[PDB]
Amino acid sequence: MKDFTTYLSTAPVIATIWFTFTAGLLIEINRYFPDPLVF
Amino acid sequence: SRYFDLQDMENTTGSWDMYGVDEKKRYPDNQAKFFTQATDIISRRESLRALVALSGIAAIVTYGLKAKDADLPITKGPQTTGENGKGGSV
Amino acid sequence: AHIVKIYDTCIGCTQCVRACPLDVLEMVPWDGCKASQMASAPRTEDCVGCKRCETACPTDFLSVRVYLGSESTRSMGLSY
Amino acid sequence: KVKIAVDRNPVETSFEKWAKPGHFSRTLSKGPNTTTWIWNLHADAHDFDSHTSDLEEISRKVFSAHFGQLGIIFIWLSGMYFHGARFSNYEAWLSDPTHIKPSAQVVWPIVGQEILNGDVGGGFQGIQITSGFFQLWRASGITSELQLYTTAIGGLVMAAAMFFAGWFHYHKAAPKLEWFQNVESMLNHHLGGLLGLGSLAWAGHQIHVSLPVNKLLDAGVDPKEIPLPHDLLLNRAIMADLYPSFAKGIAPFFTLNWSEYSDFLTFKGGLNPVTGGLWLSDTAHHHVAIAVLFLVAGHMYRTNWGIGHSMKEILEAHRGPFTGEGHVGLYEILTTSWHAQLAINLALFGSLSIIVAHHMYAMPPYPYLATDYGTQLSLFTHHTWIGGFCIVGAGAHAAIFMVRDYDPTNNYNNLLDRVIRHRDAIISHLNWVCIFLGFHSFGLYIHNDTMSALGRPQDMFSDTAIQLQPVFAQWIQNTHFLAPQLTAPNALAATSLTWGGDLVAVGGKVAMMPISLGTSDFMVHHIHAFTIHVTVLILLKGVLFARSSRLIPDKANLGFRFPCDGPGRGGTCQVSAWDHVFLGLFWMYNSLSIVIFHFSWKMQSDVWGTVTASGVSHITGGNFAQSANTINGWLRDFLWAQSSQVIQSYGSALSAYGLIFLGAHFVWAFSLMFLFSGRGYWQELIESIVWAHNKLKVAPAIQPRALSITQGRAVGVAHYLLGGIATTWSFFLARIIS
Amino acid sequence: TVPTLNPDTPSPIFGGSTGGLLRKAQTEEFYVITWEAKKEQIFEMPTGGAAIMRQGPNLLKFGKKEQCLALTTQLRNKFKLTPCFYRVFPDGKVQYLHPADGVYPEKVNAGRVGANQNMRRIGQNVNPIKVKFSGRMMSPA
Amino acid sequence: MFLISWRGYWQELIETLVWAHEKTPLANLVYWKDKPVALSIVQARLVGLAHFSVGYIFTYAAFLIASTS
Amino acid sequence: GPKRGSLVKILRPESYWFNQVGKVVSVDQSGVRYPVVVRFENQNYAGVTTNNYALDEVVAA
Amino acid sequence: SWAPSVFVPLTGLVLPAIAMATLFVYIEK
Amino acid sequence: AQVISPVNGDPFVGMLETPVTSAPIVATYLSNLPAYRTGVAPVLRGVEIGLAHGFLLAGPFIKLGPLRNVTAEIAGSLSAAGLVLILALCLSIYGSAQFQSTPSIGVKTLSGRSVARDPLFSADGWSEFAAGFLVGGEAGVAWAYVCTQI
Ligand SMILES: CC1=C(C/C=C(\C)CCC[C@H](C)CCC[C@H](C)CCCC(C)C)C(=O)c2ccccc2C1=O
Ligand code: SF4
Ligand code: SF4
């Protein structure tokens, strides 16, 4: 699993596990704080 | 059975006249004389650039200048009263 | 025809002769390099200018240069 | 001796190679020096032939790859069912087809996307689908969502099984070359089991589930009140009551009294007047016949007993005077090259998907299909496309065979040789015929535009002034409607109303009606035939000279995929077979685009619309015949006028189509940057930017490199197609839905 | 050492192709290739087509020198043979070309003095203002 | 057209055409003085650009004037 | 010449590694002009990790 | 109709006719 | 026996002698036509070719023209007489460039013996053809509207 984790730490996998995070974060914040043009 | 000869410099590359038969005149005695004499003064190449160009312009400048509805719809001209523009113009 | 020149940075690895499609280049003895040999272009009237020679050169910068020049029937790859 | 041959455990199953990108090639395995590495490893990911020379390993790779594909497709099919069960209007749609818009997608409430959930009916808010699933479901006899759920779960299991299958047949039990070469057995089993038993068992579904449930629904009885399809099996009293011949059971079958089965196995034709789809009874008998045909057909080729033909024998037999040795050598080729097979198969699949579009255009086989104009336009355009692409692909791979597999020394073939020996005549003639066609098609439209501009309508190519009547087509149409009387007596109505009369309509909308053919149709067909001939010119030229030409005699050594051979010989840009496929894609896009435009305008003007007091109001009022004769007519009466609903789609459920309308233009135009330019500029740009990075100690180890010339072309064509196609996609759907 | 004699020998088996000779061979310079094939084995026609080689001396006819050096490199690499080849003119003259000095150009042979050989680094070229007012280029200095 | 598709296609196109002419009878009796060749890269580069610009200008001009008028 | 494996800056302006660092592989003790054979970590455009240079086109730093 | 009946078809044909003729001979010869 | 074979023996010439190209017939019909004849002087060929096109151009400009719906055949008459006179410019200007010094043809026959070269290609050659294309054309045009009209 040293090998399996290196694959999970491959560029295309990290990017996707990173983007679903910073996407959610921005969808999430737009839920509880909807429709911002200030702050 | 060898197509490679320096002395035979024409058969080698394949410059064979495909359908160029060397037969006699099948063309008539009276008719070949009608159309040698008739097409012998226009023969020369220098005379064509003098005839075909200048007499050809004389063919355009005749049937070109000759002006009514009879043959074309422009020398006919406008046969109705002017239409009104967008900015109250004539 | 096209101009082809070989500069003194040549190692004489011979890839540029071996790559050419129209046999323009050849290898000559020399005294400059570890391989004791240098490239030469005595047949540039047959040169097409396709630049395989350049693509094949390992030196930095390339030690063959092809300057596309006045174009003749051979250099334009014509069979007609 | 055709038999099961397998290698046991050829490849261990640990993640040791996952963690090593580009393991598959000795070149890429070394790692990246430049960024080009990244591209290359994805470019050549599935190119097994360059990886290894072993035909065994390639063969094992290819179908396991196919089991993976099939897994994915099941998962896709699983998806649609589930959503059709969970997130849809179908039950509402199974009670008033006419007045509910088919929907099987809901948006989440955030970021204004809520507006996309439009007023679609049945008390449900959502995206109107144009896949045509709702009608499939009615045709299959589906009545409740639960059933859709259960079908979905089954597809997921099947996905698991296919994935398992693919790992298995590579990692535990990989079949031997011998195996894959059993072509006669493969052909027989695929013809008789797959197609034959497929349509047979389906026809079982149709006769036992589809036909009964459909009649009760068309009767009008509430779907909840309709008996469940297993009780149709155990209570045949309900089937006897619906069609009488069930009383006699399977006795009439064995006794050859088949005429008693005329209750549910018909040949009527036309449309079901209450639903605007083909008779299910016709379809049941269709599949029954087809099953028998395929079943007997699948017993042609020799396997493990003397009896049966040998492919090689039939091939070696078939020779004559003009061709010399004929088909000889072809078997050996077509049992050793995947590319050649791929080339064949793509041409005929592609051709098939286009004929499927038409035949689905002319003979709507599902209930309330014809009257769902969105669905009908979507399906015909779709299937016309995928066909398009597959045909170009056929050309591509044909060339790949031509470069990588052809070896006259080892695997000789004369048909091929004779083709190669006179390629110049073929290509020159195609060139000629194409200029011909171009002039006498486009030229007609330019002529019309000029005459129309110069005030001379009496001189135009049109039904009014110039007549160019499709006399043949009209003959064939003539023969088609009169056929049920003379040449096909047992057939009640015509195959299609677009040949016959009898305008059948459902819910006040036109299902189908006779299609008039005039001068405008004469025009567009010849445009098509021009476009197809040009595409064929490019691709055939590509495949035939892939190996060598007068310019580059040794093109074969240079590869299938490669940019050029320099500025020499006057300049040799786009010499490769790839470049032919490249340019072939553009002309294909062109051709296919006029077809679907032809389709859409044709349908809205001469066919579709509402049905009033004993009369018809078409959607665009029969402007086609008079407007489609000039470029200006397309520009204005089609493009300009129709784009109206897409351009004002804002503030509605259809606004996503306006967004995609603009986005697709963006991406189309964006392609032009790649297509018009060259990497020389880009690499120098990159030199300056790299400077800037180095200045701040932020330079990457993977040396930033501009795309290859080939990749520039690929990105170009890809964005060009995607942009173009997506724009037409947003166009039609917003148009036809609104 | 002596260049090749130019005799009549039979060309190898071929049904014929459209890729071959044209008007250029008649009124310009066509090309001829010579070699001694051991056995009868098939080769790729560089102007398209399958063609069977014959034993003993074989000659072919082409209208461009690429069509020779594509074939020769296909005859030299695959079959491991060694062909000579030379030009033709339409008045009956010949120009012996390859191998020019018996030795092929890649491996060194004495008596082939260096031509178009610049004896500096390329960046040690002068700027093209210093070659105006002439008919000269940037490399020859 | 001239911007996207480049030389190698067109020349080989011409290459077959120049054979086609030379073994077409009657037409055989006519031959060209100037050997037919594909336009250069730089030629293709200019000719594309020119068509593009002209089309640009003329299209707008027609639009500008017709709309404003 | 420079000692083997020493870190050397290139001063030939027309090089892909100009003002960049490389390691000396072996300086040929003969009458050759470009004896200093240098190998670098990063390739050029032409897929080459190594080149030959003269004694005035290296500086050990 | 006096002037433009003469000068339009001469500028349309007779100027390009002898221009394409005398420029062709300048090119090839 | 193979229907298709190499060109007059030679298999390394750009062509394939099909029953379309070389046969008992076709080799007799194409030689019967004016242009391919070898032994005749350069005057009579051009007239036999030139006249013919004066009738192929004559039919056209009658029934499809602007005055097709009316001067319909007077309209079609001298318009066929025109592509004649332009061909004469085309053929006189074609000739003006090419021939500076002596002829250039495949000298021999299929038999292979060195036959005398044709005047089809020469300085005084294309002149009498260009003349033949005129006198044939202009006169040959007149007889498609002395027969359809007068
Ligand atoms: C712009 C341009 C380039 C340069 C453009 C490049 C290199 C495109 C690739 C750029 C992308 C953005 C690089 C991919 C980066 C990774 C996805 C990682 C990014 C990190 C996170 C933000 C995900 C060419 O290479 C080219 C080649 C041939 C003809 C035309 C052109 C051309 O027009
Ligand atoms: S390639 Fe560069 S180095 Fe190798 S020989 Fe030709 S010139 Fe000398
Ligand atoms: S350019 Fe192509 S041809 Fe001219 S020399 Fe360098 S390689 Fe040989």
Coarse structural class of chain G: mainly beta
Extended strand count of chain G: 5
Radius of gyration of chain G (Å): 11 Å
**Number of DSSP strand runs of chain B:** 0
Tell me roughly what share of residues is in helical segments of chain G: under 10%
What does the main sheet of chain G amount to?
5 strands, antiparallel
Question: What summary fits the major beta sheet of chain B?
Answer: none
Shape of chain G: globular
N→C terminal distance of chain G: 14 Å
Number of helices in the DSSP assignment of chain B = 2
**Oligomeric nature of the chains:** part of a larger assembly
Q: Assess the beta-strand content of chain B as a share of residues.
A: under 5%
The chain pair with the largest interface is: B-I, 39 and 55 residues
Give me the strand/helix succession of chain B. HH
Task: Write the H/E string of chain G, N to C.
Answer: EEEEE
Give a verbal description of the structure.
- With 39 residues, chain A is mainly alpha-helical.
- Chain A has helices at 2-8, 11-32.
- Chain C is an alpha+beta fold and 80 residues long.
- Chain C has two helices and four strands.
- In chain C, the strands form two sheets. A two-stranded antiparallel sheet of chain C has the order 1-4. Chain C has a two-stranded antiparallel sheet with strand order 2-3.
- In chain C, β2 (26-29) and β3 form a beta hairpin.
- Chain C is elongated and about 45 Å long.
- With 69 residues, chain F is mainly alpha-helical.
- Chain F contains two helices and no strands.
- Chain F has helices at 7-22, 41-68.
- The longest helix of chain F has 28 residues, at 41-68.
- At the B-I interface, α1 and α2 of B face α1, α2, α4 and α5 of I.
Short description:
The structure is cut from a larger assembly and holds nine protein chains of nine kinds. Chain G contains no helices and five strands.
